[PDB]
From a paper:
Histone proteins package eukaryotic DNA into chromatin, yielding a structural hierarchy, in which nucleosomes comprise the basic repeating units. Each nucleosome consists of a core region, composed of ~146 bp wrapped around a histone octamer, which comprises two copies each of four different core histone proteins. The H3–H4 histone tetramer organizes largely the central DNA of the nucleosome core, while the two H2A–H2B histone dimers organize the outer DNA regions.
We generated two distinct classes of binuclears with either rigid 1,2-diphenylethylenediamide linkers, yielding three stereochemically distinct species (RR, SS, RS), or flexible methylene or polyethylene glycol amide linkers. In the latter category, we characterized three compounds: one with a short, 2-methylene spacer (C2) and two others with long linkers, 10-unit methylene (C10) and 13-unit polyethylene glycol (PEG). To assess the nucleosome site selectivity of the binuclear agents, we carried out X-ray structural characterization of nucleosome core particle (NCP) crystals incubated with each of the compounds. For all of the chlorido agents, substantial adduct formation is observed first at the RU1 site, entailing bifunctional coordination of the ruthenium cation by the E61 and E64 side chains of H2A. For the RR, SS, C2, C10 and PEG agents, high occupancy of the RU1 site is proceeded by substantial adduct generation at the RU2 site, entailing bifunctional coordination of the ruthenium cation by the E102 and H106 side chains of H2B. For the three agents with flexible linkers—C2, C10 and PEG—little additional electron density is observed beyond that corresponding to the two [name] groups. In this regard, modelling of the C2 structure shows that even the shortest linker would allow RU1-RU2 cross-linking. It is therefore likely that the majority of adducts in the crystal structures for C2, C10, PEG, RR and SS are bridging RU1-RU2 cross-links, and the lack of clarity in the connecting electron density a consequence of linker flexibility. Nonetheless in the solution state, where nucleosomal interactions are dynamic, even the shortest binuclear agents, RR and C2, are effective at cross-linking nucleosomes. In the NCP crystals, we observe adduct formation at just one of the two symmetry-related acidic patches, as the other is effectively blocked by a crystal contact involving the H4 N-terminal tail.
Numbering used by the authors:
A (entry chain F): 16 to 102
B (entry chain D), H (entry chain H): 28 to 122
C (entry chain E), F (entry chain A): 38 to 134
D (entry chain C), G (entry chain G): 14 to 119
E (entry chain B): 21 to 102
Write the structure that this text describes.
DNA sequence: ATCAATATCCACCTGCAGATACTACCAAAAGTGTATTTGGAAACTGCTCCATCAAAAGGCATGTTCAGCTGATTCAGCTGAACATGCCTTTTGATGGAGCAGTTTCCAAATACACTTTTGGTAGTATCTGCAGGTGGATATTGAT
DNA sequence: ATCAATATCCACCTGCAGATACTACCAAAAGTGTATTTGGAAACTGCTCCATCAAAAGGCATGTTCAGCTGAATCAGCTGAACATGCCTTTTGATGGAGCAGTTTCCAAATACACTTTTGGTAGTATCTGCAGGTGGATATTGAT
């Protein structure tokens, strides 16, 4: 491979409107303007936790690819069991 | 081309039994498959622990039974326990 | 010239998004975010696309449920507007701290 | 020439369930009635969920159960909702539910 | 002086607990709410412990029965065995 | 002719009870309540002494902690007085409801 | 004869740990270092806690560690508290803590 | 009559290295024992799962290590891991 | 402010509950030497599917406008905190007996092994159908007035 | 109420995605049958330790009083919802190879079995002591004035 794009600030792809939709699914009518940064933070923490575990499984298997099963097993450890992807 | 097993055909049999003109999408089946694996693992685990706690080396239908009463809630437990008792009785008398 | 009163479109959306099941975060942005976070833990990683999808389904289900709890926290405070203090109270009681 | 499933009056696969108990290392030994009893419980639960999911399919004028219908089945039933209270059904959505004070007027 | 056993969990004992939990002022209706809550807690745990007892073919609930019940209800307790 | 202000003894008891570890429910009433409840599950039961003890430690830990969350819920609604709704909100968010 | 613990430089029973692993149905088989590693981890964690619980004894002018000292040690350390976050230490009480709004005015 | 095992003495040996002038109550030791049994089960349990996910018949130190990483918070993990790799090194070299 | 009622602090003393110490002991692990079984890295290579490139589908960002929500202020009234102690429930300690736990037995049931059969998966190429997403057309909801 | 702008609900249609189908085939199953191993129920029984209860301890049910908290009413300021508008970013569909995952050989490692050595739990009798619980008097805190 030649070159490899730098990833930064991607947390900002979780847009104001996408966060409003999730609120809505969650039954929220009115949303303070500070909610959006707070939600980004909370999402970042959730992902760090689940990806860390998922990647740990990947490495323990000696792979370079994160499988759906790595994520499913990480989700199970963390008490957030997911059906629909192989477990 | 490694063979990947699932409970799909059995889920489908049981589906035809209860809603004879209803189909199921593969994603819906995937979840049904997960659900069976999940409950299997959770019953089998309780049974595992239970055996150990009682210094038994063997998991019998009695261990499974308790694991069912520990794991499931009231009414689901009552009925699951019927159908498992019923099946073991009918299994023993069938030879 | 015409207008809905504040809250009318908001309820319209609640009914709409509660009726459906599509993911509500755009796919690619969410994907980059995954790859960024993973990269910080470990370089030269790839992802099965269903892995990313598993994360997205888990992430949105988490966040939607958090907003119900949050919304119950505002309503407890005699408000209808969720604020950061509501998210925080939800997460403390949930044992996320 | 008869399977143990047909011996027990079950659609679910007793041999398979026997096999999966051994290789999962739950205990030294696995009795003969255990995979029978377990396979039945598994069948009982999956029947209960399909019955209710089928109804949600029919209530939406559909013929093919999809995950939304499984979610409606589970979440609308107190006991299935508790059994699966820490589980997430991909593509299931949530139940319609708006809190009272949020509605218009008085 | 005929009286349900739940009521032996008295106002001043419920007040003491609250206090350990940092509570300064307490609505009068709390005492009945707290008894309801305590009853459900004990039901769920005792149900599971007893189920351990019945399994071991015993007539005495051991501390290990309780400790095991607490573990599977996510309330792991240390100091009574296991 | 000397009286303590409302809430002065309340604070005093908070400091006292936070500092100690004795159980705060009388043993006997708790013992009966345990037995009563166990009777609906099986009759003619006996309890090890350590079994009843373990049940008490657990319940009080549980209740004490539920009052912490409850108290946070009252404080969220700009109060200082715990009410059943505060206990309800805490239990709902903990996922006990 | 010389104990596997002494070989590994450990106060914690490598042998017992090994055995407890076999008769635990954790796997068909068990490598030779697994109990060594496991036993070191347990010793380590035990020390850390005794270190801090002893420190608590000291503060309260005591030489005999009681449950209260394990509780103060565990809940005043962010990491131990997280590990023991769904655990109740019998006879531990709670950390002195009063919400500031409940303090009287100056 | 039946011998009732415990980690108590090993806990007590470690107490003395860490705090030679400090003692420990009966109740406190029982808690330390629960603690060791609990962490034992948690780590083994995670390790078992790891092996199974990876179709392996064996629990080696690599599984115990990965398990520790997954179970322990940050710094505790790191120090726990180094103490674990240490003891295995020393053990191999020793005849 | 002062003044006094009461809570809180520190030091010193003391009896014993609960700790550490001990030796027999013996029994049951854990470790030591010999023979057996088995697992999983390394070496190799088919081939899935992940990363990475261009064209088409529609959601995002941004500024403007004002509805109505939040949070400050005030205040009446209701409701929970504080209070004294004889009174009744819990605690402490004394004593039979239920049952749990220790032990030995023996057999029904489980593990092991070896042909024998069945079946659940996939793969190749075909064949069917539920419904998502387009249209237009008739009815509900909302907000100005 | 009336009018009307806009959203919502049908119903009807049509391509095609993805679901049901089927015929060939097979490896890994599950089944069958006979040989050998043993786990745990079953039955007697010894000794904790659990229920019960009398006497000794002491915490709580009681009703009165009013501080100060909760919650209703009111209002200004301004946040956040709605919407119009310009277009950037994601979505969708079609082409290159890193790495996964499937086969096989081979020894380094774990199992097994039996033996021989010690350690760790218990009990025995006694051995020891940290500190909870009580005293006294100095000082802090709270509340009345
Ligand atoms: Mg980075």
């Amino acid at each position: 491979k030649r070159h490899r794009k730098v990833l930064r600030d991607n947390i900002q792809g979780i847009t104001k409107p996408a966060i409003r939709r999730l609120a809505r699914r969650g039954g929220v009518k009115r949303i303070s303007g500070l909610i959006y940064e707070e939600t980004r933070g909370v999402l970042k923490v959730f992902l760090e936790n689940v990806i860390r575990d998922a990647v740990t499984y990947t490495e323990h298997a000696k792979r370079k690819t994160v499988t759906a099963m790595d994520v499913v097993y990480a989700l199970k450890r963390q008490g957030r069991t997911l059906y629909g992807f192989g477990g | 081309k490694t063979r990947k097993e699932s409970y799909a055909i059995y889920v489908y049999k049981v589906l035809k039994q209860v809603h004879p003109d209803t189909g199921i999408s593969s994603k819906a089946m995937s979840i049904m498959n997960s659900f069976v694996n999940d409950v299997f693992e959770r019953i089998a685990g309780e049974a595992s622990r239970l055996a150990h706690y009682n210094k038994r080396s063997t998991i019998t239908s009695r261990e499974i039974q308790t694991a069912v009463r520990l794991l499931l809630p009231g009414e689901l437990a009552k009925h699951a326990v019927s159908e498992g008792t019923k099946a073991v009785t009918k299994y023993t008398s069938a030879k | 010239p015409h207008r809905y009163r504040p809250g009318t479109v908001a309820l319209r959306e609640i009914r709409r998004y509660q009726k459906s099941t599509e993911l509500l975060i755009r796919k690619l942005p969410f994907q980059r975010l995954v790859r960024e976070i993973a990269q910080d833990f470990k370089t030269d990683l790839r992802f099965q696309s269903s892995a990313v999808m598993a994360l997205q389904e888990a992430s949105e289900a988490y966040l939607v449920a958090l907003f119900e709890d949050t919304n119950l926290c505002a309503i407890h405070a005699k408000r209808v507007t969720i604020m950061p203090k509501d998210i925080q109270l939800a997460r403390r009681i949930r044992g996320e701290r | 020439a008869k399977t143990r499933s047909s011996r027990a009056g079950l659609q679910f696969p007793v041999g398979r369930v026997h096999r999966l108990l051994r290789k999962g290392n739950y205990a030294e030994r696995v009795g003969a009635g255990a995979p029978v009893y377990l396979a039945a419980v598994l069948e009982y639960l999956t029947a209960e969920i399909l019955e209710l999911a089928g109804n949600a399919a029919r209530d939406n004028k559909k013929t093919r159960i999809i995950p939304r219908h499984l979610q409606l089945a589970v979440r609308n039933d107190e006991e299935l909702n508790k059994l699966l209270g820490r589980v997430t059904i991909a593509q299931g959505g949530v139940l319609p539910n708006i809190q009272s004070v949020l509605l218009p007027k008085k």
